[PDB]
Amino acid sequence: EDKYTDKYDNINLDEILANKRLLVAYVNCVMERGKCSPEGKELKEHLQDAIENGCKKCTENQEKGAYRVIEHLIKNEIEIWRELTAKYDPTGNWRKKYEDRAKAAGIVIPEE
Structure with a gap:
């Protein structure tokens, strides 16, 4: 229940940013496609x-x-x-701030 765990408050944030395999898997889970949403649901x-x-x-x-x-x-x-x-x-x-950056850098959603 909350606890302190490793470092500050972070859920293995490393494994999720370690590689696209997890970063994408989670991102894919956000789409609730199947056997993904529930998994990353935590x-x-x-x-x-x-x-x-x-x-x-x-x-x-x-x-x-x-x-x-x-x-x-x-x-x-x-x-x-x-x-x-x-x-x-x-x-x-x-996220507006999170998006604002993508404007200064250029990296924006690949909307076709």
């Missing part, structure tokens, strides 16, 4: 509850690791926005 359940409109009261580190993951995933394959449309869409407040 990370999505803990994320939506923490990151973004979920735990504004939380410390702050989470916000850092997140953005870092947003900047990394953004360039990794800007699949983020894709997951955003599938989840965290109604939010449209925090």
